Symmetry: C3
Subunit: 410 residues, 3 copies
């Protein structure tokens, strides 16, 4: 009988938890929480960490397959590096937000009561090589995202080159195989949506605990995050888009007035994928060639998830300082390196950035299995339902603003 | 040149072993056995444990795919829960047999000379979550059937939902991918048959050892098992079928006289799969609609393996008490929970229930790799060639008796 | 801008390294090498060891699929065992070369400064069973080639039997699934070629180090290898081919004069695969039936890589004695057992035998991860670009000489 609009359904869990949390935050100790409540939350998270691999894998082989040079027209080539570098400065800005805002510093948690100290990172030499799977499956089997990616990529590539062969039996193999991976990719997504319906019961149990414990000083950071994001966000639109809108003689203001229908749909639908109908509709509405938006719009909804890139860029810096940890340059550049190759997986749905987070964590040697991290992420996940809104509303903006740029360039 | 009818071929190994065992049971110590003989047996078992995963996996994703709601007509819906609950009480009865018969108590073995004590089971909290793979591959890679299942299922589901999409490229992906898994599924089966031809040389080496050692007090349990089964079995037909045959105004006695051809073929062919021709033949023979038996008969031959459910239900209780172990309620209900989701894999062939056993073992934390268990299962496997006969002859009965019930209901 | 003909491109790295090595072999200690140079080499090797599994797997399931009895005409049957036994004596000869030549004895290396002593090999009993994967994935995940093979094979088989079924849905499954594996298989190959373009930068860094260290006494073995090979090689042609050419009343000398175009193309192209056009051209040129060379030539270019079989047969014996190790009979027969089931994978491309080497190593418990082995293989790999030439030129010869033999037999 649970049919309600997801977003509220969650916001229902979200606003109602806080209180039931804080009201149980004074009276019956948070331990009842800890034993009767958390058990429902984690399942959630676990239900996510579950997917991370297949979807880190499948997604990126297929990801690569779309981008694979030059199984793309010079029209893509143009738009491609738009996306890269708009996704690239996106996070550059995420750090800026996260270097002027320090949410998590002043929350620092002891977990079980023990502070966390990271395991030593191997000589820069090794770390390189370590990207090269010693053995695909053996790497794939257990964590080690650094290679998992590397590989899957090189596959995607190799694959595109197989459809371009003399032999037909061969030319074929690719198609199928590839296809099959894809869909695995897809299935994921749909479990994601299945998950994002336990998401209400979920988000409730998690945050309630984080409010039950940590007192209330928490929300101060939580809205301090929300800030760091939106304020990053809205500024991104001004600093990058409006900046490049005029740089090809397109009126930025009007552009928005057109995209006003689609964006303020993305805001509330959060599905960069299911909101394709709306997107391509506005496309022609503002005078874009069929043969141009028919290709970019179905590609940027997936890749160039510039909004995600930031989210992580920031979310990262929340987590680290919540452990009271300092992020060493080398991994500061990793965050992004990752955070980008992250958004090449995503297809732009509900949980999206959340799961990736893990991914960016795991790469930077912050194993979730570690309770410190665990209880911290746990927060960000709760609220993710919110940040997600604006995030996906910008992912979308980012896609049209490329489209119009290559339609004028075209 | 080894061409002989499998069943005899085995019974040949089976009856001839016992003697050559017991005759070597008095004279040249069983150690010669242990060093020249067992080495051939185990290979067998190993040849089985080998398959368990793929076939625990492939089978259940595809399993799910057939059942996936509502990628089935309301005609299935009806028959579905017949099967469930006839498979469900089936094992309920298996426990009854195994609580009035206690085969294994009075055989209790020391293995290397050390008794076995089970590893502590995690707090009921964890055990739940532990069903959610932390990471598919990483779980899939090594045991942990509890999740392997959970997952594969949720996949099967997700998959059916992919063929029901707007996008065609998508609608496709499912089909193929799915397909491909399926066939992996199938291949298994055919190696199974390839195995069940080493089965003669196999069953010989195993039991001979168990007769070489353990003296003879063993057969007392072995025929005490055979009992517990058949007597469960024949009674199942009376207590359930004849019970529900009349409960829709169908004459049970006649029904049998019709099914008399097909069942007494299943008894001897043991292939719930290859015996489909015979099944559907009798179907119309007793007045069943084409559009009704064309769907149930090709589905119940695979799922609703009620005979299997018991076999395990019982086999379980043999093993445990052969170690001198007591089966805690919580895992007593697991056996079944499992034993059912077991028979959703199986396609109904030779080794069938045997392999699953492992599956139900592994779930209930009884690692075969442990010699105690190892030598015990080892027995059940030998004789499985027999119990199998009646077992598959009932699996079949169970399928027609549903069919006629929904054809009258229809 | 790196476009140059691969072979030179490498020989360029190869001849130029030696010197820059030896010149840095007297002056600035080899340690600069060790810290600025090796790091580039290994990557290479790592880039290979990476592939070994998929391609050990995919290749052999599909391998099996071609050979699977009797999903082949009695025309294959004939040619099949030609290939087997020409691949079989091939290596028999490889040992002969490697028992009269002892390259590596007189190079013996201390690695870090510690000699290597192999881990004890389990009782011959276990080792057998150990071929039967305890669990496919779990084996597949981490090394254990002995089973990986065994399994994949039994699959290939099982698969062919699935396309020969009553059920169509089934008949299908096989096709796709199979296909899909295949192509994975293929992709590999193409990354191989992608690798064999870092191969110049690669082969440079590796050998330079091995010249930087070990002084120069090395080349003495390196050309002593080159010897052991070519001299094995050219003799193989005389001892086997010319021997069996006349044994069916075909003139060996002429045969060569015909194959003179194709072989001396294989020598320089090293691609048993891309050189199929040339092969089948000469086929009719020397009077071979369309319906005969259309089947053997596209099968022997892949299987019956008799040249490979030797390479390893020998390469093995280089490595072992470079560690100062003695190769126990039981594993001496393994080398081959392997080395053959090796060449059933390969499709006959650039790196080919190199990677397999690993495979034959891993089986004979010589983990590359061990630096001793590591620095040694490392040599063989460098020069492999050379030996490869003759090797593939004979693989090819081996294929026509079967073809003509079954065309006369036919
Ligand atoms: Hg995660
Ligand atoms: Hg098992
Ligand atoms: Hg290797
Ligand atoms: Tl986007
Ligand atoms: Tl994406
Ligand atoms: Tl059945
Ligand atoms: Tl089944
Ligand atoms: Tl060849
Ligand atoms: Tl091959």
């Amino acid at each position: 009988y649970i049919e309600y609009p997801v977003l509220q359904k969650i916001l229902i869990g979200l606003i109602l938890g806080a209180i039931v949390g804080l009201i149980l935050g004074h009276y019956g100790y948070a331990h009842a929480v800890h034993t009767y409540v958390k058990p429902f939350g984690d399942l959630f998270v676990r239900l996510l960490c579950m997917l991370v691999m297949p979807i880190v894998f499948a997604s990126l082989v297929v990801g690569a397959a779309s981008i694979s040079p030059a199984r793309l027209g010079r029209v893509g080539v143009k738009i491609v590096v738009y996306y890269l570098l708009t996704s690239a400065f996106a996070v550059t800005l995420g750090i800026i937000m996260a270097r002027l805002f320090n949410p998590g510093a002043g929350i620092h948690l002891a977990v079980g009561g023990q502070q966390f100290q990271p395991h030593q990172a191997p000589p820069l030499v090794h770390i390189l090589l370590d990207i090269v799977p010693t053995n695909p499956f053996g790497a794939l089997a257990n964590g080690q995202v650094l290679p998992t990616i590397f590989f899957a990529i090189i596959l995607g590539i190799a694959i595109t080159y197989l459809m371009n062969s003399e032999n037909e039996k061969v030319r074929k193999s690719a198609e199928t195989l590839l296809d099959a991976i894809n869909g695995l990719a897809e299935a994921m997504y749909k479990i994601v949506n299945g998950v994002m319906q336990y998401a209400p019961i979920g988000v409730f149990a998690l945050i309630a605990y984080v409010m039950a414990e940590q007192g209330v000083h928490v929300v101060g950071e939580l809205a301090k995050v929300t800030a760091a994001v939106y304020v990053g966000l809205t500024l991104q639109i001004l600093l990058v888009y409006f900046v490049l809108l005029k740089i090809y003689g397109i009126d930025p203001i009007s552009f928005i007035k057109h995209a006003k229908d689609a964006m303020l749909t993305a805001f509330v639908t959060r599905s960069s994928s299911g909101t394709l109908p709306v997107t391509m509709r506005v496309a022609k509405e503002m005078g874009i060639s069929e043969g141009i938006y028919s290709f970019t719009l179905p590609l940027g909804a997936t890749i160039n998830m510039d909004g995600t890139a930031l989210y992580q860029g920031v979310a990262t810096f929340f987590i680290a300082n919540a452990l009271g940890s300092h992020l060493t340059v080398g991994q500061q550049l990793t965050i992004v390196l990752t955070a980008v190759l992250a958004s090449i997986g995503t297809a732009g749905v509900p949980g999206a950035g959340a799961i990736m987070l893990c991914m960016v964590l795991h790469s930077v040697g912050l194993p979730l299995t570690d309770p410190n991290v665990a209880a911290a992420y746990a927060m960000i996940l709760g609220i993710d339902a919110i940040l997600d809104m604006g995030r996906t509303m910008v992912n979308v903006t980012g896609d049209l603003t490329g489209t119009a740029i290559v339609a004028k360039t075209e």
